[PDB]
Design a protein around this ligand. Structure first.
Ligand SMILES: CC[C@H]1OC(=O)[C@H](C)[C@@H](O[C@H]2C[C@@](C)(OC)[C@@H](O)[C@H](C)O2)[C@H](C)[C@@H](O[C@@H]2O[C@H](C)C[C@H](N(C)C)[C@H]2O)[C@](C)(O)C[C@@H](C)C(=O)[C@H](C)[C@@H](O)[C@]1(C)O
Lengths: 54, 122, 118, 214, 113
RNA sequence: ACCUCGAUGUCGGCUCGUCGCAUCCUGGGGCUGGAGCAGGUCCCAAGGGUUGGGCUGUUCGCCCAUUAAAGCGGCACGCGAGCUGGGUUUAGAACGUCGUGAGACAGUUCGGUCUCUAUCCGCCGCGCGCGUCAGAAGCUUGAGGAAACCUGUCCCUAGUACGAGAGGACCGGGACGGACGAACCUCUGGUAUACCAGUUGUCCCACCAGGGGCACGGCUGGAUAGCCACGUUCGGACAGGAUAACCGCUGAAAGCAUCUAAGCGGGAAACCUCUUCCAAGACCAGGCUUCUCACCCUCUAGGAGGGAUAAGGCCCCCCGCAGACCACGGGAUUGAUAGACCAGACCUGGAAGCCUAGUAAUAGGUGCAGGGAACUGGCACUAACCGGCCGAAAACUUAC
RNA sequence: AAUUCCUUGUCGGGUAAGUUCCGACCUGCACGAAUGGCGUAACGACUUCUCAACUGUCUCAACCAUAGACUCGGCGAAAU
RNA sequence: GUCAGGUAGAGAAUACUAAGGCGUACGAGUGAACUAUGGUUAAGGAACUCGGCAAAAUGCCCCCGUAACUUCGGGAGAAG
């Protein structure tokens, strides 16, 4: 089918607001004497040196 | 598990060789016929000279079924062919000899004449 | 192992078989391999079953491994270094470490290594 | 006035009767239930007995639930569920801390077994409502499992509520009624209930006395 | 092991020979037709044996009066009084469904010894 | 000829319904033109159900076999952004009739493209956010809803009123059913794209042996788990209340008074409880428990604005038979959550190697062998992390 | 006569119900072809039907895989 | 338009492969429904449907053996 009316600004924006990113949950990891923030998912990899922290 | 248009062999000496199930009796929309279930059929093949002619609408009781039938004791009975015996409204066989084995479902359903005439009721 | 519940990992059952075989070969060769996390998860049981065959060092187990690995050098590596190395370890011969996702598709990535702590 | 016991659907198997007839029996761990709370018309407005079932670790149990069990005077248990009773004498029968064993039922007692059915996921109309599928051939274009028509035309002008459409099925409360208890294994705290009971193996179930065939 | 083995062991019975698919065996089935309990002997080839514990069933096939009859029983069925293995069979698979399409002398089965 | 010709898609069938009652069971009245009975005609009271085929474009019908019955209609002659396209009505063609002809034909025939990713409402399911007067937590609790409601034979009553028979009951009491629905997987049976086995062609692993890749999982024989039905089990109920027709009251506003008047009391499937399920967003938000029973800072020291939080919960992580993306279980190991490993179960069916017998194909022993998965136990060996986010009261009026 | 409008009824054959069609009896000045009507082996992706076999077309649907759909990341329209 | 390896094979079909050339340009995941393309299917077996549409089935080589009718060629690979 095809949109019959132009969607109003209010509806367009109400439903567009749902397209949002979720900020990652960052935990502290100590590497090379420095305290970096990495996802708890990558916590182990960062400890083992498998995360490129630049 | 016999339904409409299923072809069964006649386990009887009525001259009819094969029948086509027209209806499974037992209730409206009654779907399947197992051992001991009665069906009105039509004779599709028959001995050229005999009591039963081709195209005769008859009543028969399924005596052997290819689909395995469960039993109260957890056992099952299965046959190599679907066979019915042509009967009359007295629930008695139209013929005099029953060929091949039959199930105890006939005894349960009070097809006692068929059970007695059957060479082996399993 | 337990079969893949969902769509097979290589886009087909044959490709999943080949892909698991290659991943197991690479893991047994280089010790650790980086690959998409689902591939690591599917490989870990596969690789550990192969390592179990290696531990049961025998010609029958050698043949059972060679019907999946097809690499004679890696088969020898298994049966001469990885079976003897894990003789004392009862299971859990591999370790999955979740790493950062790829820049091209954001695919979850994981490094699967052979355990060495003993 | 109506017995009941919380249990777990251990599995299903078959036994044999005195007549050698096979009885398909679900084996349910009608394990010990501890009466944690009594619901009364004076305090609660209804007559019910709260039962707790299943071993849980106190570390797992949270402080609100732990305090409720402390007030009851009993060790916290994994599940808690209420059994409704008609009259007040039914709860006068019960008391907090009471031990409810599978022996409350007897062989041949008809029970209603309530459980959460298996999750069938997002099911189509054919699986979910028994919709007659459309034809596999004879021109049918990509409608072999689709619902068909949904409403009328301009006159309703809409789809009625309760229209049987495709959606998530299963995971709903189901009470299978008048299931005969073939045997009451008092030694193992188990009930062999003839037939099937809703839900997966290991799921929480409530075996109450049959409401109809009391 | 199975979670319901403590329930199944009660119904599991002894007096079950070590029959295998392909063994010719006669099962003595109790039939209570007409209030009278008698024994009917079903002699045939074990073409199948599926299941475990109490729920295990075995299928016996015999040709009778020109009609092949398969009759399945639970292995630990109380309605079976005795299963007697007449001769062992040297079959090459667990299930002998192919014996359904075979008739006459081609339905022979090799015997171990 | 009033909307629609800058388009409102036709008949039939399919699919899915929903509604009406103008009744094909369940209750009655009359006829008893049944004196009677089995039956039946007629007229008053929708919950369910109301089959499958053949010939039909077939809207209609007829036929076959059943059925308790095979209801009639509305919903754009419901339903083509749901399907088909047989009919019908383009363009080809033949025949028949008309026409000089082009052509025409509610004439007979064959052939003849069914588009669209759903914005809104609607509906079916899921979440996120807020509420619900502190911040949580289990247990709920029915206002209101939804689902279901079908009905057969056979037996006893009973060969029992008629009392000539033939034939043959109501009402009750049992057995077994058909269709439908739900759950479930013990059985049976289906499936099985990492299971086992056999096997063809080919190419490989140097070669033999043993295997692998590909050929639909190459094919074939099986096949546990899961999912299933053809399977298993269960359900429609039993009761209560209010209701057409049938009555009761002493008998009147009215006389031997009178079914009944005005008043007041008693007897179906429909209705309301009852059964199952949802359900406090039920804006009118229950009995318990948990922390606290304010930790700190800033403008005001009113009313607020932020941190930390106690309580609990997400997010991450291991996961599931829970799943489109949610929520449920386990876990910051104080752990069996998954995998592995060890066993068992189960499926296959007798592995590899070696030895033996055969000029060999192959067979036998090693050996219930080997291989293997979902199930069941063990087993911290691997991963569940040496972690981050949220998450507490303005009070005032009114008896003791 | 070979001539099928044939509505031809009647009867059958074929189905349990059998369309297409096949037969005899049929149909009277007929009726339509002394050359435009009938036959005709072979042939036909022609139209119609009956059989055997076969089957998920169906009773009546179930399960498996893959491409979508669905989830995440990137790019990113359309009719209206 | 030219060349046309090997093994099966009649073959330039088909399968697998040599040489040679490619993995071709969105990916990763995920057992939803539903759609598409494949696969299997108990018991029936056209009961589906306008219609056996689709699917299923037969399928190759060698021995036999092959009907009505015929234009004497065929039908015919009849059929079995
Ligand atoms: C594939 C691609 C095409 O799809 C079709 O062909 C479908 C299958 C036609 O139906 C086919 C089949 C069928 C039966 O469909 C209705 C038929 O009637 C039409 C004529 O052709 C359509 C839809 C016709 O519409 C229908 O036209 C009728 C005249 C009236 C009807 N409505 C207003 C009443 C209207 O929607 C019509 C004319 O093509 C629409 C116009 C816009 C088009 O030309 C567009 C460009 C089409 O080419 C197309 C959509 O791309």
């Amino acid at each position: 089918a095809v949109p019959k009316r132009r969607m109003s600004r209010a509806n367009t924006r109400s439903r567009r607001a749902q397209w949002k990113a979720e900020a990652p949950g960052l935990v502290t990891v100590s590497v090379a004497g420095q305290q970096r923030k990495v996802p708890r998912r990558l916590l182990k990899a960062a400890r083992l040196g498998l995360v490129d922290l630049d | 598990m016999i339904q409409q248009e299923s072809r069964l062999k006649v386990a009887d000496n009525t001259g009819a060789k094969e029948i086509l199930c027209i209806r499974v009796l037992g209730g409206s929309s009654r779907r399947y016929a197992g051992i001991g279930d009665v069906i009105v059929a039509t004779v599709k093949d028959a001995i050229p000279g005999g009591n039963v002619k081709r195209g005769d609408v008859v009543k028969a009781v399924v005596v052997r079924t290819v689909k395995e039938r469960r039993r109260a004791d957890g056992s099952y009975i299965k046959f190599d062919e679907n066979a019915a015996v042509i009967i009359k409204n007295d629930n008695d066989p139209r013929g005099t000899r029953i060929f091949g084995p039959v199930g105890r479902e006939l005894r349960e359903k009070k097809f006692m004449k068929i059970v007695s005439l059957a060479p082996e009721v399993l | 192992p337990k079969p893949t519940k969902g769509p097979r990992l290589g886009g087909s059952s044959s490709h999943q078989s080949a892909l698991l075989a290659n991943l197991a070969t690479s893991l047994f060769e280089h010790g650790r391999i980086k690959t998409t996390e689902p591939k690591a998860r599917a490989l870990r049981p596969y690789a550990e079953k192969l390592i179990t065959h290696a531990k049961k060092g025998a010609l029958h187990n050698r043949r059972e491994v060679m019907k999946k690995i097809r690499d004679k050098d890696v088969v020898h590596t298994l049966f001469a270094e990885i079976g003897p190395f894990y003789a004392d370890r009862n299971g859990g011969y591999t370790r999955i470490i979740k790493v950062e996702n790829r820049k091209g598709d954001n695919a979850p990535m994981a490094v699967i290594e052979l355990v060495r702590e003993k | 006035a109506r017995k009941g016991i919380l249990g777990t659907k251990l599995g299903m198997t078959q036994v044999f009767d005195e007549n050698n007839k096979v009885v398909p029996v679900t084996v349910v761990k009608a394990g010990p239930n501890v009466v944690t709370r009594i619901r009364t018309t004076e305090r609660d407005g209804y007559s019910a007995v709260q039962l707790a079932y299943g071993e849980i670790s106190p570390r797992k149990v949270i402080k609100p639930v732990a305090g409720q069990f402390a007030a009851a005077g009993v060790n916290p248990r994994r599940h808690v569920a209420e059994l409704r009773l008609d009259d007040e004498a039914a709860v006068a029968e019960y008391e907090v801390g009471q031990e409810l064993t599978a022996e409350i039922f007897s062989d041949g007692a008809y029970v209603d077994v309530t459980g959460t059915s298996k999750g069938k996921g997002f099911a189509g109309t054919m699986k979910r409502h028994g919709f007659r599928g459309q034809g596999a051939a004879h021109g049918a274009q990509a409608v072999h499992r689709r619902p068909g028509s949904i409403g009328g035309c301009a006159t309703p002008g809409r789809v009625f509520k309760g229209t049987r459409m495709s959606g998530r099925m299963g995971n709903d409360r189901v009470t299978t009624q008048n299931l005969k208890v073939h045997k009451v294994d008092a030694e193992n705290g188990v009930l062999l209930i003839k037939g099937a009971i809703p839900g997966r193996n290991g799921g929480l179930v409530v075996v109450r006395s049959a409401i109809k065939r009391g | 092991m199975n979670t319901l083995d403590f329930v199944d062991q009660a119904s599991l019975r002894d007096d079950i020979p070590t029959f295998s698919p392909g063994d010719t065996v006669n099962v003595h089935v109790k039939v209570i037709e007409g209030s009278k309990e008698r024994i009917q002997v079903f002699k045939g080839v074990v073409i199948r044996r599926q299941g475990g514990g109490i729920s295990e069933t075995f299928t016996v096939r015999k040709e009778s009066y020109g009609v092949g009859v398969e009759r399945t029983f639970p292995v630990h069925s109380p309605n079976i009084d005795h299963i007697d293995v007449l001769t062992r069979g040297d079959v090459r698979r667990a299930k002998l469904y192919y014996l359904r399409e075979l008739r006459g002398k081609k339905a022979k089965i090799k015997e171990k010894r």
